[PDB]
Amino acid sequence: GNNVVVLGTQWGDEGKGKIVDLLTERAKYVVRYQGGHNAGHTLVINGEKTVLHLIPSGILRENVTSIIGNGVVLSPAALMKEMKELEDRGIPVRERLLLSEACPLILDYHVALDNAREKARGAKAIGTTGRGIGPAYEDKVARRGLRVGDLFDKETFAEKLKEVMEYHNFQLVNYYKAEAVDYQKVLDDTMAVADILTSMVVDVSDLLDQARQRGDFVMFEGAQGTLLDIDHGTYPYVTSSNTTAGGVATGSGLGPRYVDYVLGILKAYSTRVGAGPFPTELFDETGEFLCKQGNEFGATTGRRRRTGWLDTVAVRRAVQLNSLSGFCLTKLDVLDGLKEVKLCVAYRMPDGREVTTTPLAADDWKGVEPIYETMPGWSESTFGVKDRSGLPQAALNYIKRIEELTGVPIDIISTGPDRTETMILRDPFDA
Amino acid sequence: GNNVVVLGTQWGDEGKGKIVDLLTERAKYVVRYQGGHNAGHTLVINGEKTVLHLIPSGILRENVTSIIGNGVVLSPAALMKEMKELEDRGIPVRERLLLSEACPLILDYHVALDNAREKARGAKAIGTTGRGIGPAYEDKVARRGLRVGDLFDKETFAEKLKEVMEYHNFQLVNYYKAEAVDYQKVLDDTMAVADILTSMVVDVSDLLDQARQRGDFVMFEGAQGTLLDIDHGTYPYVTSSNTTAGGVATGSGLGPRYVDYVLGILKAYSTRVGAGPFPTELFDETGEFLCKQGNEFGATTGRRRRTGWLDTVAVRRAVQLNSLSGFCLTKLDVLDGLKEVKLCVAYRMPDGREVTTTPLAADDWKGVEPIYETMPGWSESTFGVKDRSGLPQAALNYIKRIEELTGVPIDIISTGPDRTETMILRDPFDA
Ligand SMILES: O=C1NC(=O)[C@@]2(N1)O[C@H](COP(=O)(O)O)[C@@H](O)[C@H]2O
Numbered sequence A, B: 001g002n003n004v005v006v007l008g009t010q011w012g013d014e015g016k017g018k019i020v021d022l023l024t025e026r027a028k029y030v031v032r033y034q035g036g037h038n039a040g041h042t043l044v045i046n047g048e049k050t051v052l053h054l055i056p057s058g059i060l061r062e063n064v065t066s067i068i069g070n071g072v073v074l075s076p077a078a079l080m081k082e083m084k085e086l087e088d089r090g091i092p093v094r095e096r097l098l099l100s101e102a103c104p105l106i107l108d109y110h111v112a113l114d115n116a117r118e119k120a121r122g123a124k125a126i127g128t129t130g131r132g133i134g135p136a137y138e139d140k141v142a143r144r145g146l147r148v149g150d151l152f153d154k155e156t157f158a159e160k161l162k163e164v165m166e167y168h169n170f171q172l173v174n175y176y177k178a179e180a181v182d183y184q185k186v187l188d189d190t191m192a193v194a195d196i197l198t199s200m201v202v203d204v205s206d207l208l209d210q211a212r213q214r215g216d217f218v219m220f221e222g223a224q225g226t227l228l229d230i231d232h233g234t235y236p237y238v239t240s241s242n243t244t245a246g247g248v249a250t251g252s253g254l255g256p257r258y259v260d261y262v263l264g265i266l267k268a269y270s271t272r273v274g275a276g277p278f279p280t281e282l283f284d285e286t287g288e289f290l291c292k293q294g295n296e297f298g299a300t301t302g303r304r305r306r307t308g309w310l311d312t313v314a315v316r317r318a319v320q321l322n323s324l325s326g327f328c329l330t331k332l333d334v335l336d337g338l339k340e341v342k343l344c345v346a347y348r349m350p351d352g353r354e355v356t357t358t359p360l361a362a363d364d365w366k367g368v369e370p371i372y373e374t375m376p377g378w379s380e381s382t383f384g385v386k387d388r389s390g391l392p393q394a395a396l397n398y399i400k401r402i403e404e405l406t407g408v409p410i411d412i413i414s415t416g417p418d419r420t421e422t423m424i425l426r427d428p429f430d431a
């Protein structure tokens, strides 16, 4: 329909960016509704590689306005850095972007609290991106945080900023025994971008309701993935926002009765960055092969993605939590050449019990062992294939089995990192 | 349809409880999806008055299972107290209730932090219920909190509880200069109900998906109201959960594509408990009349609800944020006898600008003045009227004007506090 959601079905890095950039060809708006710059979406258009974080993946398209919904926690620092890079490449960011004055703000003290809490978690550290996302979300629900809107009044922004920092620095210095964050610096840094931000503000919910009445095509871009949802994820190894489809209404202001189609991105195999249960993790040659072939290295120490077999027990759970209406299989080609492929269809509980639904809290996962279904791999290359008929039987069978186990059709198939290396079986805007 | 949501369109106290108890006659399940015991829903069935908070309003009905979704922050203390009262009245609570092991826990230290933060807010205090709701929601998004699930392991519960309390008491004692909360007490108190809780646990999302496949009728009961939504509300004078319809998916685990009808409860006039902008507030005889007639006194100091004219600018905003499909007008009778009635149709900005959309942040509301539409009241009684034809023209006109301004039909009309003093024009389960 008009309103199509694009979220990750696993633990992030499913290939959301690419898919949004692809389908936005038909959208009037693309909307980010949760998370922050902890997200990293790489795009490759005809060879050119663009990496975004905070800015929505529809930015490289003209005649498509990008909106950062109130669900997004916003770092003006990161937003700046990200605007200049594209503005440099010749992308007219300032002209295609719009913000919601309801976005909380991530400031220096959040990144600091984030690092402090992680070092304090010690061995049980989460594996945070270190961008101050959780801290920002914490100030928000605690009703103490600043939001873009707060910048309309430079004078008040100052008064409020002082109280909040007073509280946080007390935490840091006295409790985490850490360096205090300089109030004046932050005040200055922020005040200097205050006018860039406030000028891109728009009442998003009103806008989204209008577009709904005109029939505009809206594409909501999710970040992270279903199993990192603060509620339904593998708490506490999870991100602090709702990554599931419900966060679209919550983080954008669009009534829930208005989501028309929910596209779940499904990477052909599993990965996980950070700590957390992963029943399907590989520590062998295959595990090695998937990483080298997937090229999931990270931006830095600790962002080297873990790999493993596609987990259908966990996917079926992303199916119900999101009322998915279609899957988009990405990275099918990373499996090329393997002798046999495998997919988890049940979990064997420590007590011998074989279940088909996933546990909730991370502790509840501690002893599950996957129960796979093994099937033949394929030697021929699937990389770059644009036609279905050009896919090897074994590959097509892998696809069909995913469709039988989950009950959801696979509508789009990505066969390469390029925007053009894709097969659109059924367009979400057409259903 | 099968899935009907019932949330408040204003600032809470619209009459949600009554309406849920009423319509659940046809539901298999009733689900709480956000908030805690800060909510207070009074029921009056054939004279008998039941006041609930944490337990869903479908509890007094047999053949209807009540579920407390993961969105609810849960106080085992309050749950207990609430179970015994009903169990005493003869209501078999333990047998009709089900919990989600994903609900965070509100423990002594949250109520303490809540009181401490409020006293520290000084003149800018929020007007919190003092039940530790915000603090509980803060531990959750900070990934440090305990959840019902944590109780499955008594031993671990202890280990985790210690770290969390260590952190909170440091805050209290050193920063809020307040009394520390005793770890051992809390450990003991909790451990003593641990087995009541864990025994009522159920995987709610899986359950809700099943019921969806069988066609069961599910009623989601919202707490508070649209304008107290942590995102879209009058921040910071707001509650710390998403009161808007999106919180249904987020707090229950039901895919958003599955909400069939959203019933917005609309009290015939406005009220607000706690601090916060209220453009339509009355400080005159009428203001006095609405309170005495409404009987919105509170449970204690500071719960005396503020009153004012129905605000259509603010209601139209609850309309888009929730994709409402019907209104339920309650307390129409409180207006009986008034000479003329009024409703806000626009806001006059300080700078003379007359807008039709509401501001976001509370500060953005500071100088708006309402622009009303005045119409004739009615002398005849509407209290207890069950038939539409028995309503006085002026009353019917008031109704129709609400329908023209908002574009949403008024499907149910409550004419008295009793479950039977209602007119069901169109049933949500029938649409
Ligand atoms: O963007 C993210 N992807 C994640 O997997 C991740 N964040 O979610 C968890 C919390 O990180 P953060 O709070 O920084 O988003 C970590 O696993 C982190 O790596």
Ligand SMILES: O=C1NC(=O)[C@@]2(N1)O[C@H](COP(=O)(O)O)[C@@H](O)[C@H]2O
Pocket (backbone or CB within 6 Å): B011, B012, B038, B039, B126, B127, B128, B129, B130, B131, B132, B133, B134, B224, B228, B237, B238, B239, B240, B272, B273, B274, B275
């Ligand atoms: O249940 C509530 N109704 C409210 O209006 C209210 N809570 O929302 C605001 C925050 O309260 P709390 O965090 O306790 O829910 C206050 O106005 C409080 O009165």
Ligand code: NA
Pocket (backbone or CB within 6 Å): A012, A013, A014, A039, A040, A041
């Ligand atoms: Na990524």
Ligand code: NA
Pocket (backbone or CB within 6 Å): B012, B013, B014, B039, B040, B041
């Ligand atoms: Na109430």
